[PDB]
Symmetry: C3
Subunit: 494 residues, 3 copies
């Protein structure tokens, strides 16, 4: 007399839990991770030029420490400073080291151009055993130590014009004697002085005499300062003692260059994202590996996981199992048997019982889901030279702000990630339920007065509906007028 046609949605045996706007742990038939939590441990030397510092820091490579001149005129996309690095040359100090380290790092080059300063009344090339270069004493390859010639130290007053169309970064210094005795014996005057200026900037450092800790055989020091000279501008160096003169300039640039402190072994491979932990794939939108990055990278978040639903809910409402073949619809059950689709049909008629998935709805759900997927991982976000976020020394005010800006950022992005994943998951679940409900309605209208909703997601079709008939319903060509009469009779009184 009649037939049965249930509408349904697939379900899987082993599903996944995800967060939403109302349920923290709600099961879906699938999910993709959004937080990269692991690194390979090795820094890929492609596609960014990785200049491993090894035993050198950027500053030592800059200054010309004897064990670092292998980096002379080096360039890099990312300079990697090793923790084992050490300095073996004249014990010096760089006031505002961080800034110098930062500005050179970003320049991405130690391209030094010797200029030819004529120092009359002293004659260059001082050297120390602390900076043993080769067989005997040496000094920073880029700095020029000037002492006394004969028995005097004429007031040095030289200039160097920047006729070039680029910024010149002059690195110079001043010597801090251990004793007034050392001061005099080297620079004659009781107390020397150094003043490096351009038309717009000036700096006059006074050598301070005193006994520091013994480092590499000395109690005296060298303070490092720098001076950038713009095009047209000129550089004047005046001094009456203690001048650790520059030998030229370092050509300055701007680019994607930066510097990273890491102990990760550099390796031959490709990876756009670099963290001190090693390279990390930037396929996912967020990462929990490190907040220090370089290259196209996933945003750092505090979360070690954020699963994005890429499927509908699993076996409706949820939990375990039961029932059997009487044919039930999409109400409180999904079909673990439908692997050939997401949504579909199951009929029980004259010819028996079977199932056929509806690719239309299956595709739409799948499509919309890939639509949000691409959107969620469509961005890249390249970040190169940024701020430091780990610090060796207590500094106070500037560090607190540097630490506060990042935490502030990290927290804002974690929330962004948490909310996005929830909104997206809520949407995906509604979107999938919607596709299902849509199919049921589409079939509901096709059947007209020839069938009744059995409340279980199935329609009781009040007329002989063999497989060919069941098919027509599935492929939208079901002509209801054809069976209207029989159904109207079977329905309204048997």
């Amino acid at each position: 007399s009649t037939a049965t046609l249930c509408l349904g949605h697939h379900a899987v045996p082993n599903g996944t839990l995800v967060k939403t706007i109302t349920d923290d742990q709600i099961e879906v038939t699938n999910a993709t991770e959004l937080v990269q939590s692991s690194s390979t441990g090795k820094i890929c030397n492609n596609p960014h030029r990785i200049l491993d510092g090894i035993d050198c820091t950027l500053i030592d490579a800059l200054l010309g420490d004897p064990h670092c001149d292998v980096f002379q005129n080096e360039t890099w996309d990312l300079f990697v400073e090793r923790s084992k690095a050490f300095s073996n040359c004249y014990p010096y100090d760089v006031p505002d080291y961080a800034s110098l380290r930062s500005l050179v790092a970003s320049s991405g080059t130690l391209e030094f151009i010797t200029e030819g300063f004529t120092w009359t009344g002293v004659t260059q090339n001082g050297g120390s055993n602390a900076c043993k270069r080769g067989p005997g004493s040496g000094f920073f390859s880029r700095l020029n130590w000037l002492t006394k010639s004969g028995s005097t130290y004429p007031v040095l007053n030289v200039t160097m014009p920047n006729n070039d169309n680029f910024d010149k970064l002059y690195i110079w210094g001043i010597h801090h004697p251990s004793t007034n005795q050392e001061q005099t014996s080297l620079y004659v005057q009781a107390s020397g002085r150094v003043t490096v200026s351009t038309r717009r900037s000036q700096q006059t450092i006074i050598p301070n005499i005193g006994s520091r800790p013994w480092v590499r055989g000395l109690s005296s020091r060298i303070s490092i300062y720098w001076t950038i000279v713009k095009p047209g501008d000129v550089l004047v160096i005046n001094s009456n003692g203690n001048l650790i003169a520059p030998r030229g300039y370092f050509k300055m640039r701007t680019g994607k260059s930066s510097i990273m402190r890491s102990d990760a072994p550099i390796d031959t491979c490709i990876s756009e994202c670099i963290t001190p932990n090693g390279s990390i794939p930037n396929d996912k939108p967020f990462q929990n590996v490190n907040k220090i990055t370089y290259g196209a990278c996933p945003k750092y978040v505090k979360q070690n996981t954020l699963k994005l639903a890429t499927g509908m809910r699993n076996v409706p409402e949820k939990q375990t199992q039961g029932l059997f073949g009487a044919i039930a619809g999409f109400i409180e059950n999904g079909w673990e048997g439908m692997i050939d689709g997401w949504y579909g049909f199951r009929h029980q008629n004259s010819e028996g019982t079977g199932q056929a998935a509806d690719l239309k709805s299956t595709q739409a759900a799948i499509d919309q889901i890939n639509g949000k997927l691409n959107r969620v991982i469509e961005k890249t976000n390249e970040k190169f030279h940024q701020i430091e976020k780990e610090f060796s020394e207590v500094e106070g005010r500037i560090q607190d702000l540097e630490k506060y800006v990042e935490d502030t950022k990290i927290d804002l992005w974690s929330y962004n990630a948490e909310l996005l994943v929830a909104l997206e998951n809520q949407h995906t679940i509604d979107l999938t339920d919607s596709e299902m409900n849509k199919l049921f309605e589409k079939t509901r209208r096709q059947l007209r007065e020839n069938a009744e909703e059995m409340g279980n997601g199935c329609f009781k079709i009040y007329h002989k509906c063999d497989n060919a008939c069941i098919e027509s319903i599935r492929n939208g060509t079901y002509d209801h007028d054809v069976y209207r009469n029989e159904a109207l009779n079977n329905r309204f009184q048997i």
Copy 2:
């Protein structure tokens, strides 16, 4: 025997594409831009007091450079520093220039109050040809150059009590001789010294001697320093040479004042938002003109566009055209013919065929949409003195942080904008579909057992329904019992 009544929604010929949670390019019947991408090129001198610096910087106007004293006692809401600006006076330098430039800018005033310092043992008014004021040599109108009287320079020790109920900003300085010869001939002592203090703060600067680049006929310089004196507090100035004494104080304030570097021509007009590019209308929530702003402004984002749907989807599912007059509902088609509403009806009956839009639903959709519109552009956000985001010089650490804070902000707001627009557009589309579906249901219940859903968004009304009848359905007064019998007969067997 019967009649037909379809439910529908309008559609337009030329529609717009917008982003959503699943589709990046989905067409709607309308959209409003959210990102202001263009500026007029001129800065409106209303409603903010625009003080054009012209050939002056704030610092030169402060100090009293001869070509800037036209700004004496000036006030402003926004000081606009021109790129052509130049200094024509004593070659000086302001350590922490930026801060002085910032703190004066925010004070918004150069209201100078001469105090009457008695300098015994020297006698004021030094002047230089580099600072040619009028016919002969001059000097910063606000600074007082003190040299030597007779043949000595008594240790200057004066004080100035802040009995006023406001902060006094004292701008003073120190002279840096080119040669010890110049030092002595001006201040007698081999080396002078300057110390400006209050009960809580102190600063002792030592004049450093040396040859700088020749600027305006000199190799010597003047360093500028400042001292703010709180109420009750007092200012003591001690020196034994090189003192470029202050002439009084600048009254300090707090307000909405700031300073902007721009080359935009100032123009007579009204506009709350100012960018270096020129004023921009702040009617939209975001802007892509510049991250440097002043006044009620749209938040800066990296996006040059963000369209906000202000209409439903266009001609259902989408693309091109076809079919004709057989009367179809809101299913896969919208009505380009319904310009008198958003939703409505179309019937085919005894008297012929026609259309009538339903203002109820039309208004609701329109209302909700304007509701979100107002919300989206209800805020103002006035921001006045902020941080600098463009820098002429390489500085390192502080610049990296200043650059990092803004990028961090800019990226967070771009995401905010991107997500908001998507959520809003997803909502608007659901909201509109909902209004439509609601109408169909309302009509569905009105018709009771007298009609059947033809699956195309139309109802086949199984009874004679002339236009007057069609009207009653449209205006909720359709009494179904009246035609129940005829419909029940026509339906359940003809």
Copy 3:
């Protein structure tokens, strides 16, 4: 012949207004506040160790001002600096005071360990009447004033090795004479000098002579500087005059410690969150009390209120009253009579009329709502030492950035709060309407061809349905085949 069964949802007399994606003021049956707007006015000394500074600042407690030595070796989780605090000891100044104040505050301890410096050629314990300790002159308990012995001041050159496995924070200083006369009479040399170094850092301060304002009977000052010495590292102090020597070191730590400027009375109570205004309950996600906080606290936002809907909409569409007992469903009216549930039924049949709420839907709505509630207030967010956000002095550049970072944050979180509340409220309203609509559908399917939707949210059940029958429908056991015939007859022609 028939019966009536309406589906409905409760409503309350006095409801609340909340924001959503389309309506700013839409009424719901309930809402929970999200913004903590009030503080008790007292700081709870539990669970954070509150060290009230009273008349002392951290720096004075550090240095050893006579009226502060009650804080010797103090520890704290939060040091509270009182506005009444004052200094009564040698008039000094701390260059970069803020940083010292910050780094000690975070250390959370003033655990001083005297080291035993041998000062040969001078002999310690200088004292002043400005720092009257007890009966006569005294000095900072942690600083050691060294003058001249006999008639000379030997070049002090001592060292102190950090053999300890922790950072040592040495606080030292230099004396600034009022007159060269005072300089000589105390330190012999025309001009002394101080240089404190470690193997990696150095600082050489030169005593600057001059007359400052008279403070506590003096015109001379003491500048404070500090030096942190790492493990293995060593500290060398060299000087030829003006050395205000340290007496040992302060053991350095890292932790949750911080410092807060407040005038709130400390009180015995428990509260994780501290604001200068006094403790505040951190049960709510956001707070509008102050942007300065310590402990697990609600995020600061500019909003003084953000209500989170914790109930469905009130009496449908909205406004006032009317109608009566004819029995209407959930369409444009809610039932103020249903206090025993959120959703439910009302029937009119043979036995009369009554109401019975449906706990199934009632529970689901309630559940989902508590689900989002917990999520909304599931986080804690502990923040300890952060940046300062209120400043006593004009500083410029660093303050602008510090001010800009916070405003930037505050604005981003206000938006986050505004959007979250709207999304959540939109969700809650849909979620509740959905539960209602779901119930109606569930009943719709149960009734099959035995009833018709009266369009008012009620079903006209075309068959004798006494209370026992009405019950079966309510508890899902309604067998429709039983009354199918009678209904089919009553329906399709009476």
